[PDB]
Write a protein that binds this DNA or RNA. Sequence first.
RNA 1: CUCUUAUCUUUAAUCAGUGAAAUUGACCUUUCAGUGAAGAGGCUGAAAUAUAAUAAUAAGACGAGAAGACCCUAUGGAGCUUA
RNA 2: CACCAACUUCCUAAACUUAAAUUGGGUUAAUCUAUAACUUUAUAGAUGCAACACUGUUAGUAUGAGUAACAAGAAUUCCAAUUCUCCAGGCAUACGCGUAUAACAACUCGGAUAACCAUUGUUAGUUAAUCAGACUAUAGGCAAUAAUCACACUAUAAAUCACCUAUAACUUCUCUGUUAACCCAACACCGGAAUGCCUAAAGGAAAGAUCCAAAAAGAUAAAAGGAACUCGGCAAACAAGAACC
RNA 3: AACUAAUCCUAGCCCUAGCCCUACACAAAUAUAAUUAUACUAUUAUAUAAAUCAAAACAUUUAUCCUACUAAAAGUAUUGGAGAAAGAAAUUCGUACAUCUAGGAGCUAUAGAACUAGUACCGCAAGGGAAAGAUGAAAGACUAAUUAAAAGUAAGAACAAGCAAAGAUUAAACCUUGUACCUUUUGCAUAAUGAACUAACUAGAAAACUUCUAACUAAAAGAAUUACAGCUAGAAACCCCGAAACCAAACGAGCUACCUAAAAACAAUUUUAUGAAUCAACUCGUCUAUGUGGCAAAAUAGUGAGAAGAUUUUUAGGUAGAGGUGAAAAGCCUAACGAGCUUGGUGAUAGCUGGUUACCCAAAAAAUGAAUUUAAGUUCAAUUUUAAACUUGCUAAAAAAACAAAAUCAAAAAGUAAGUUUAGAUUAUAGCCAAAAGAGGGCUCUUCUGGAACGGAAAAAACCUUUAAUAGUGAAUAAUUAACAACA
Lengths: 108, 280, 140, 97, 166
Amino acid sequence: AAPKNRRTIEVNRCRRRNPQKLIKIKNNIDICPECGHLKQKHVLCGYCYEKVRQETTKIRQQIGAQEGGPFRAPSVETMVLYTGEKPSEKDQGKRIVERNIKRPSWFT
Amino acid sequence: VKKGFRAAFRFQKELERWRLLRCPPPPVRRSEKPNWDYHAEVQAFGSRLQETFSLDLLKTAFINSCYIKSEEAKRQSNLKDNQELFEQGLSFSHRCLTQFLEDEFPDLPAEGTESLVSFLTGEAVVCHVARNLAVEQLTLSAEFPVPLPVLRQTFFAVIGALLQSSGPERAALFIRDFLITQMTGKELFEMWTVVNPMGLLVEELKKRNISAPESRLTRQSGSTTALPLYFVGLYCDRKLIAEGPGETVLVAEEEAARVALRKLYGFTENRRPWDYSKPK
Amino acid sequence: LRNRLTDRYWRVQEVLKHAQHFRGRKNRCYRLAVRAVTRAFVKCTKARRLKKRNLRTLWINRITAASQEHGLKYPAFIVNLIKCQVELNRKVLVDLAIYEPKTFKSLAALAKRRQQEGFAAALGDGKEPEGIFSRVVQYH
Amino acid sequence: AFVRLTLPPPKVVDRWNEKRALFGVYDNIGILGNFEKHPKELIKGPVWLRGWRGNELQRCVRKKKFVGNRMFIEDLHNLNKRISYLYKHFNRHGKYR
Amino acid sequence: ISRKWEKKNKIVYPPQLPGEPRRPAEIYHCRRQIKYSKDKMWYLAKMIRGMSIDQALAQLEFNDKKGAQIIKEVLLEAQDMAVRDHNVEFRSNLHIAESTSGRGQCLKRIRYHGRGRFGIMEKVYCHYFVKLVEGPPPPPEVPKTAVDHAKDYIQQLRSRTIIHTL
RNA sequence: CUCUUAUCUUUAAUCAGUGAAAUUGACCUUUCAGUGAAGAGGCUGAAAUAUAAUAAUAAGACGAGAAGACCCUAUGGAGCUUA
RNA sequence: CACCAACUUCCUAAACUUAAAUUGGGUUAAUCUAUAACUUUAUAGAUGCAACACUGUUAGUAUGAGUAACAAGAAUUCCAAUUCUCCAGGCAUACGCGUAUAACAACUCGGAUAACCAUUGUUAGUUAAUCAGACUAUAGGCAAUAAUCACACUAUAAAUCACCUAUAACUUCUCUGUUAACCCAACACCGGAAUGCCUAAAGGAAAGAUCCAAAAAGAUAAAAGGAACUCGGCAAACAAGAACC
RNA sequence: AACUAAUCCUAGCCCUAGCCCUACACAAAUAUAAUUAUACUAUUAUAUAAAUCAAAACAUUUAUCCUACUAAAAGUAUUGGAGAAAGAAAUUCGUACAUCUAGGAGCUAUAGAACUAGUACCGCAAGGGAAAGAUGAAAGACUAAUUAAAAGUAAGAACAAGCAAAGAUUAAACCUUGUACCUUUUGCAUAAUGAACUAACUAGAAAACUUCUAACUAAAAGAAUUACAGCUAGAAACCCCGAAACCAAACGAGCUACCUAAAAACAAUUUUAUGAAUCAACUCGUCUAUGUGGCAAAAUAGUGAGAAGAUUUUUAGGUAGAGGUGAAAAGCCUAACGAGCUUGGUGAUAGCUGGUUACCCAAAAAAUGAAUUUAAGUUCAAUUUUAAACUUGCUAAAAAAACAAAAUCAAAAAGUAAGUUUAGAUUAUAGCCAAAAGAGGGCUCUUCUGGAACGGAAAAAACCUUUAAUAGUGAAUAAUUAACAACA
Ligand SMILES: [Mg+2]
Ligand SMILES: [Mg+2]
Ligand SMILES: [Mg+2]
Ligand SMILES: [Mg+2]
Ligand SMILES: [Mg+2]
Ligand SMILES: [Mg+2]
Ligand SMILES: [Mg+2]
Ligand SMILES: [Mg+2]
Ligand SMILES: [Mg+2]
Ligand SMILES: [Mg+2]
Ligand SMILES: [Mg+2]
Ligand SMILES: [Mg+2]
Ligand SMILES: [Mg+2]
Ligand SMILES: [Mg+2]
Ligand SMILES: [Mg+2]
Ligand SMILES: [Mg+2]
Ligand SMILES: [Mg+2]
Ligand SMILES: [Mg+2]
Ligand SMILES: [Mg+2]
Ligand SMILES: [Mg+2]
Ligand SMILES: [Mg+2]
Ligand SMILES: [Mg+2]
Ligand SMILES: [Mg+2]
Ligand SMILES: [Mg+2]
Ligand SMILES: [Mg+2]
Ligand SMILES: [Mg+2]
Ligand SMILES: [Mg+2]
Ligand SMILES: [Mg+2]
Ligand SMILES: [Mg+2]
Ligand SMILES: [Mg+2]
Ligand SMILES: [Mg+2]
Ligand SMILES: [Mg+2]
Ligand SMILES: [Mg+2]
Ligand SMILES: [Mg+2]
Ligand SMILES: [Mg+2]
Ligand SMILES: [Mg+2]
Ligand SMILES: [Mg+2]
Ligand SMILES: [Mg+2]
Ligand SMILES: [Mg+2]
Ligand SMILES: [Mg+2]
Ligand SMILES: [Mg+2]
Ligand SMILES: [Mg+2]
Ligand SMILES: [Mg+2]
Ligand SMILES: [Mg+2]
Ligand SMILES: [Mg+2]
Ligand SMILES: [Mg+2]
Ligand SMILES: [Mg+2]
Ligand SMILES: [Mg+2]
Ligand SMILES: [Mg+2]
Ligand SMILES: [Mg+2]
Ligand SMILES: [Mg+2]
Ligand SMILES: [Mg+2]
Ligand SMILES: [Mg+2]
Ligand SMILES: [Mg+2]
Ligand SMILES: [Mg+2]
Ligand SMILES: [Mg+2]
Ligand SMILES: [Mg+2]
Ligand SMILES: [Mg+2]
Ligand SMILES: [Mg+2]
Ligand SMILES: [Mg+2]
Ligand SMILES: [Mg+2]
Ligand SMILES: [Zn+2]
């Protein structure tokens, strides 16, 4: 079936400017207290989450170097230490990961 | 590229039209534009109105004080004002206009016959009349378009010059023709503002020793709806004097007062037409 | 291309200036605007004559309203005024009813009386004096 | 339609240059000169149409007679084809018989 | 091609007199050739009409359309030049007066079909325009009240005249 | 088939990116009876009737593309067979 | 016992009388030349001298429509990296093609989208007396008996220069092919494409994200009945069988 | 308040005049599969042009094509299905611009050459064959401006009701009136062709006769011609696009048909000793569904036939259109073969289809008779018409005939303005409905009358009212779907 007539610019304006087809405004945008960048209420902050993932990559890069190959997963717990820190008694017999930089303020 | 210059010439004219509509030009006084001779224009002004003027007097009327200041400032880098003629011309018009009104409407109050004269010598009427007689074109001043207070002054100065040349009787015809005509089709209270018309009516009836009127409802329609019509009639000694329509009883009652007043002062709609027949 | 028409711009604008108040592509496309403008001109010419007939119907409608307020039908009112040698036309009669209510009422009584005189003359037969308002002035 | 947005440069014509000033001179060479020369001999143009006039078919046939043997191959092929087309139009087609 | 939006930034008014309201500033900015359809860009340009700069930038940051990112960068440059070149005091004191999309110069290519047939393909482009005006956004629209509706109706009835008569 | 049902994949629908085709006199594009060229959204008479989108059905627009076929004509053609 | 109703007729001003092939006459838009004019004009002489319509020709832009259709296996410590889930024509030669090869840089155009490049620019590359191609001493003389593991064995279609006789010369390595994700089909086309080795040790990825409606396509399962379906057991089947014209 | 766009002037070209030419372009390479430094192995256009087409068919025939000085003799003598047509010579005339190395009432980027180029691109090949550019004195001044200006969009979606407008109105919409345009049909369309919109381009051409305006005049004309008022000069005219075909010469067998030479492939199992059997590779294509601008201009998914032979496959060569090849399907010969493709003859021809561009005034048809390989066309009569000369016409029409037991005929009058002769010219040669009278028996013919609203009969080509066409807020009228169940 083919169109029997051309549709006019007036009719076309009514189809594509209908309120059903317009972009809706958002009411759930807020500012992040820690960084001051914007976020949605039900979603994690992107800027703050970006910090954590960067550190996570560094730790995992170090973990890869120590193991030296695949199929080398330890059977004991893991822990991370930064320069100026030494293992406690409770830390005995647990894999230790060493980072050159100092302990990040946010990391506890 | 077609050969010929005639189509290119025509299109330049249309580009001129388009530019004018989008960017209208600032006003200019006719003296600047071509085809202007001051002496000839003044003479035609008098002959147009079928009145004879003395050239020296008429020219003085158009000159204004502000014009003198501008010329001297340019001069640094004689004339004579129209102040004398303005005062004389305005004074006679006020007296002449009052004389016309009192004879036509003797009963009408004194304050009334002052409002109408003030109405007919205001900027609105005088400026409107002045422009259509070319007075603005012949005026000499430092600002164009001419401000209304300046335009009004030069108008009465011209009447003053006419008074000196041809005397009172001629000028009285001049005021009748051009100023009295402006009240055609105008209702009284449109030119005179009266609040609380009933209060004024009560005092007027007292002077002739008539009893205060009694308000009553002569006719009624659609009272409970949002579009009601009311007729209220003022009854005196059980005798009807006036009847008025209105949306509400208070509005309709106030309307009856104005109808009554108009009859008392003889400024009704069906009153005798004014008389311009007299050639004297 | 020795000779080419150099004036087509102004020939187009003659049609399109008469189409600016239309709706649709009729107000800017020459092949469509030209057809619509000629249809408008034909309607304009035929409506000059129809206008005069329409206004007469309006006058007759308003006259019937004014007469019935005094109890008269339209045919009786118009016919009897003619028998009294009154030659006012329908256009002016409408003006009196709207703007001169008292004068219109006077004419209403005159037409009614002449009608009554005709009825009396019809029923009574033989030679009898003619009605006061039923006397016709003559010209020569 | 679209029109120029500027005026074209002006055209200036000299009406008293030599060619214009002396136009017509010697058009009466015969009557005022004892008829030694005919005015037609004053004409400049193609060899086959000096002092002669004709319709398009006549012009084509006359051109071939005068310079047909000194023409280029392709030009002569087109001239011959034009003659036959004009022959069939003027002798077989038209409103009037 | 026309480039007039750019030149609008170079108008110079004469100095204002002391007894006059302070004239607000105006900024015009655009980006010209963009690989995006103008029909699609319209919906984005329409949304931010009338809003302040901060509210506009907030809504743009969480839209998924490719056009949203491009509009945001144009908005940021307009804000920067407003303070740096047009003597605007406070960054936040700005609202979007005008925003719209326009057609650009496009390209034609071939689109293949299944019986040796083909079609004509267009690679489409668009422009984006904005005007920034200093000051808080103007107040929104208030629908007519019932009393306001009625007052119009009486006005209509009062305007009537007696038609086609003396 | 009586007499159909359930599940998964592809399609479909919503979001992001790129983006064709036949078609198109203008359209502010309703129902019933009548008129008519077996024929009316547009004509006559009645009736109904706030404005716009999204997803579905195929009665009508004598719906679109048919190199689709049957009948006739032209002092238009071509292949075949001859006595 | 009337009224209303057509430029029919009268009135003010005017006018001077009834579809169409074809036929007779008065003007005029545009441009050029002669002679004039000077914000675009006059009298004459001329012509490629006027387009709402030829399924007209060329270019541009709409409608259908932001519609039909198109695409990348997962996580990470990252795209010539690791591990996991699944699939099953690969490596060479011939013919053809002609820089699509590799690195860096770009992000315009190209890939029907991104990432990344197959795109743009700049610089580089394929090495042979053995693999492959081309490769001029002369004149005479002369042939019964296939192949197939060739023995046995038959058969029928009867079947791949050598060696001698004389003449002449009497120490040599130049030249050319060599890359690739590639060719014929308008396309990065579910098509076509010879031979040798081998069958996973080689080579690869069906899902952009989400949702679980109708209709449409494909697969599998089904109570009781078993051709009642239909032009016809077409299609499907836990059947894949027999006979006759 | 602007996007997409638009404005521009010179690159070159066209027709004549003039003139022969001596232009034949470092080194090296090339006729070998050209552009490869040396021996193999020899090298060479063509017998008369045809057909289309005109003759309204076609068969003898058909200007130019197929060249031999201008002007005249002359469209004459002659030739010809004696018809379409074709067509001389004898004999007269002429030194011509003659540096005119120059000229243009020729074109200016859709024009003028196809051309910025025989390039890009398409085809195996012969061959076909495009599109477009724009600042200023200076860019060693940052690339210039100018334009409410096309369609299309944006700024700014919509608001009961209707060919979208017109009369209007205080008021945009509401009320009233109104069956889109061109062509074709029977003067009729809600019939049927054609059109998405914008810009540019795109179709009537000739001088025998006639009429008008001048010169001279028994003569006119610048040699050859006409003349019993003529002769000389000027002005006045007759379209566009579109086939299936036919002929000449090239180019094609890398697809397909068949053949020649040199090569190659065929596992496992049962039989035997084979155009045997089961069934892969490989070759083919029975049946069904999907797909139908498809992945594909013939495919995909399943299911099927052959598979040691008349088997299949590779490389190179051969046969060419009046032909070749064919286990004959009138199959195949580079996607479209009852006869290939390309260029040319060629602006083939078309009694058939479509189109054919400003205004005003005036007049006007019937579409009956005759002939025609004629009925989809044409010629003659008849009609109409423009001009001119000069004199009776139209309606009516007594008797008295001729007829047999209302058509001719046209005295005298009256109402009235036409009619004949001369000269020139096309178009048209099918109608439709109503009302009468017949004839073949609802159609079909023949004969007399009327009609083609803007009003009326409901809408309403054909019935009824209506002498042209203009402005007005005047008036009198016409036609006008309605009419008023027993006894007596
Ligand atoms: Mg609507
Ligand atoms: Mg009337
Ligand atoms: Mg498109
Ligand atoms: Mg999408
Ligand atoms: Mg509607
Ligand atoms: Mg119906
Ligand atoms: Mg209807
Ligand atoms: Mg349907
Ligand atoms: Mg469907
Ligand atoms: Mg159809
Ligand atoms: Mg025939
Ligand atoms: Mg024939
Ligand atoms: Mg033939
Ligand atoms: Mg009339
Ligand atoms: Mg006509
Ligand atoms: Mg033309
Ligand atoms: Mg066209
Ligand atoms: Mg679109
Ligand atoms: Mg749709
Ligand atoms: Mg959909
Ligand atoms: Mg889809
Ligand atoms: Mg995938
Ligand atoms: Mg690479
Ligand atoms: Mg890279
Ligand atoms: Mg590359
Ligand atoms: Mg070797
Ligand atoms: Mg050899
Ligand atoms: Mg290799
Ligand atoms: Mg293909
Ligand atoms: Mg494809
Ligand atoms: Mg692998
Ligand atoms: Mg999925
Ligand atoms: Mg099953
Ligand atoms: Mg079951
Ligand atoms: Mg059965
Ligand atoms: Mg059954
Ligand atoms: Mg089966
Ligand atoms: Mg013939
Ligand atoms: Mg001779
Ligand atoms: Mg060109
Ligand atoms: Mg060209
Ligand atoms: Mg526009
Ligand atoms: Mg309406
Ligand atoms: Mg048909
Ligand atoms: Mg069409
Ligand atoms: Mg046009
Ligand atoms: Mg072969
Ligand atoms: Mg082959
Ligand atoms: Mg075997
Ligand atoms: Mg086969
Ligand atoms: Mg078998
Ligand atoms: Mg088998
Ligand atoms: Mg076998
Ligand atoms: Mg057979
Ligand atoms: Mg057969
Ligand atoms: Mg072929
Ligand atoms: Mg033709
Ligand atoms: Mg007849
Ligand atoms: Mg015959
Ligand atoms: Mg015919
Ligand atoms: Mg007689
Ligand atoms: Zn944060």
